[PDB]
Design a protein around this ligand. Structure first.
Ligand code: MG
Ligand code: MG
Ligand code: MG
Ligand code: MG
Ligand code: MG
Ligand code: MG
Ligand code: MG
Ligand code: MG
Ligand code: MG
Ligand code: MG
Lengths: 88, 117, 55, 106, 14
RNA sequence: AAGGCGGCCCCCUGGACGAAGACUGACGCUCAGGUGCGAAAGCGUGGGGAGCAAACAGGAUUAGAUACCCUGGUAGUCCACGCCGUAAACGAUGUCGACUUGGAGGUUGUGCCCUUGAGGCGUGGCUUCCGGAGCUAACGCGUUAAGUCGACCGCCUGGGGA
């Protein structure tokens, strides 16, 4: 996905410590930065439908992860949607 | 009339015709003989004995240059590959090099269709 | 681990006509056999091994 | 940061212009935090088959550890220069420092 | 074969 | 994922698998409409043109040759930009999970071992051929099931008409 400095920093941004890496809010941010990384790629490479399958996998994966936090704790849900620029 | 003393035999071997051609080491041709004009037409042209007399008659037209050491370049999958080399030794030459120079494409062009019979 | 620069190893793995000997004859591993294939193709561009016996 | 092995051969009539191209290309690499690992001059070497109607090509082997800044410019100036007749770069696994089998035998 | 399939549409009598 | 994918090298990028732990805490499976991909032929616009080659030209063949065979040859095959969305698109087997004697191997890892050799001993991922029980109309399948079961979806109801 990204490098070691880009991955481990965002875990420290949204996690409580360095060990808080398996939580759902980190997993949203791992997909949020990756889709934002691939904005200029698929604009130049519209004929790459095979990497688009990996793109649509991560969009569908992020949608399933937002539905779990929304059905359990809406206080943490409303924080992250504006903190990463979601809901469009 | 001229002395080269170094022969190169680009001999051809197709399924229909075998062509014996003597040349030098620098591309300048010295003589040729085909199996079509050697008294062999059609099915008789596609015989290994036709290649036995084509190499001998082409050799009789290149002894004016005094060639003793020649090179054999075999080109093609056609029959008569053995009958044309023994005919060069039957003409009084010192055989030195034999080399298969058959062109092999690296799937460059598309081959033609099948011949179903 | 394998490398294209040691051409003495590559001379033992080709023919006189520059053809690549498969792993059936030499009995080498299939892990190196894909690596030995691309290592010759590196040396084929750098004019270290001839393509055919024609030239 | 990537690890590159850069192979380029020089036209044999300009074999004295080779140490000029060694240090002019190096100063652009090392200024932008580019490391270097191997720099071996081999001299003339017999070809397995002729290229560009020539024989006895000059060979220079390199290893450059540098980011993607130099990989844009150096491949274009190889195609821009007429002395370099063949250019070839490749990505390696690690920064390596080991003599070639050509130097160890010659 | 599935009972949950026949909730949407029953078996078509000819 | 499938149709498929093959000179080399660079750049961007997708998934798969293994080892050691840490971490979230059922976040899962499945899918009617909907969405996208999707062999080749063909279509629209503009390039490109070797070789091969519908239609067609010519010559043999023949009762006639329309086909076969041979000499040529346009569209098309190539690229960009779209559209078309059908195939014997087949493993003729929808997906997921759980178990049930096993071999010949291949591929890809990893752990330990007089390293006493690229070996010995284990142990996961993928894959082919045999074959027991069992199943099956037979053919055959048979730890990758077409064995025993669960979860959900599609589809079939004599042939022809179609
Ligand atoms: Mg990856
Ligand atoms: Mg806990
Ligand atoms: Mg049209
Ligand atoms: Mg035709
Ligand atoms: Mg067209
Ligand atoms: Mg159909
Ligand atoms: Mg079958
Ligand atoms: Mg039995
Ligand atoms: Mg069986
Ligand atoms: Mg009916």
């Amino acid at each position: 996905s990204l490098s070691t400095e880009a991955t481990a920093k965002i875990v420290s941004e949204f996690g409580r410590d360095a060990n808080d890496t398996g939580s759902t809010e980190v997993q949203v941010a791992l997909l949020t930065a990756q889709i934002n990384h691939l904005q200029g790629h698929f604009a130049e490479h519209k004929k790459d439908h095979h990497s688009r399958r990996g793109l649509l996998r991560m969009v569908s994966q992020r949608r399933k992860l937002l539905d779990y936090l929304k059905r359990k704790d809406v206080a943490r849900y409303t924080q992250l949607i504006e903190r990463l620029g979601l809901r469009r | 009339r001229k002395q080269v003393s170094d022969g190169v035999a680009h001999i051809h071997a197709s399924f229909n015709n075998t062509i014996v051609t003597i040349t030098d080491r620098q591309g300048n041709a010295l003589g040729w003989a085909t199996a079509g004009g050697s008294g062999f037409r059609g099915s008789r042209k596609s015989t290994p004995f036709a290649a036995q007399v084509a190499a001998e008659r082409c050799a009789d037209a290149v002894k004016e240059y005094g060639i003793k050491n020649l090179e054999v370049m075999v080109k093609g999958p056609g029959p008569g590959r053995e009958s044309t080399i023994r005919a060069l030794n039957a003409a009084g030459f010192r055989i030195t090099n034999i080399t298969d120079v058959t062109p092999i494409p690296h799937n460059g062009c598309r081959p033609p269709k099948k011949r179903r019979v | 681990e394998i490398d294209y620069k040691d051409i003495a190893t590559l001379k033992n793995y080709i023919t006189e006509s520059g053809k690549i000997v498969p792993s059936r004859i030499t009995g080498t591993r299939a892990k190196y056999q894909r690596q030995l294939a691309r290592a010759i193709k590196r040396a084929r561009y750098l004019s270290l091994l001839p393509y055919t016996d024609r030239h | 940061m990537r690890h590159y092995e850069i192979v380029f051969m020089v036209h044999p009539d300009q074999s004295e212009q080779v140490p000029g191209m060694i240090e002019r290309y190096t100063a652009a690499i090392t200024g932008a935090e580019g490391k270097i690992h191997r720099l071996e001059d081999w001299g003339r070497r017999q070809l397995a088959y002729p290229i560009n109607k020539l024989h006895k090509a000059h060979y220079v082997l390199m290893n450059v550890e540098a980011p993607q800044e130099v990989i844009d410019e150096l491949e274009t100036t190889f195609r821009f220069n007429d002395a370099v007749i063949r250019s070839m770069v490749m990505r390696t696994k690690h920064a390596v420092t080991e003599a070639s089998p050509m130097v160890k035998a010659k | 074969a599935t009972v949950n399939q026949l909730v949407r549409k029953p078996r078509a009598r000819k």
